[PDB]
Structure formats: structure tokens, C-alpha cells
Amino acid sequence: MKSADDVKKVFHILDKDKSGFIEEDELGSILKGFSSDARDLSAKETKTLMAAGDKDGDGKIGVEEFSTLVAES
Numbered sequence: 001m002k003s004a005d006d007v008k009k010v011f012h013i014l015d016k017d018k019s020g021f022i023e024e025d026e027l028g029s030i031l032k033g034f035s036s037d038a039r040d041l042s043a044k045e046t047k048t049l050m051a052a053g054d055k056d057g058d059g060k061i062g063v064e065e066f067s068t069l070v071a072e073s
């Protein structure tokens, strides 16, 4: 389990425009937020991930939804 501070650090790295949410144009870099040597997601993978992760349906991923995505299974 990653700490809340660690999770927020990655969220901030992904939120390039500081909007407070990860929009579609920022989500493809998600694996890179954790390890710079990770691959980019394809456009199709990004759209799929956005749909799966956007639990409240507002079209973007906020901090709680992002935390849920990375919660330890």
C-alpha cells in the first residue's frame, strides 16, 4: 500500500495543467508517473482506462478516483 502523500505526488506529476483533475490528454502517461522507464498507453487504452476509472461520470479523474485506481489489490 502506497501512502496518501505518495499517491498525491504522482497525481500532481500527471496533472500537468494544474486543473485538479487528470483529463484524457494527461492520462496516457499514467505508468510513467510511477516509473520513468514505463511505456505510454495507446489512445485506445487511455479511453478505456478513463471510462473504467471515472466513477462519478464527470469525464475526468479526481484524486479519490485516482487513489482507487492504484489501491492495492
Ligand SMILES: [Ca+2]
Pocket: 014, 015, 016, 017, 018, 019, 020, 021, 022, 023, 026
Ligand atoms: Ca489536469
Ligand SMILES: [Ca+2]
Pocket: 053, 054, 055, 056, 057, 058, 059, 060, 061, 062, 065
Ligand atoms: Ca470523475
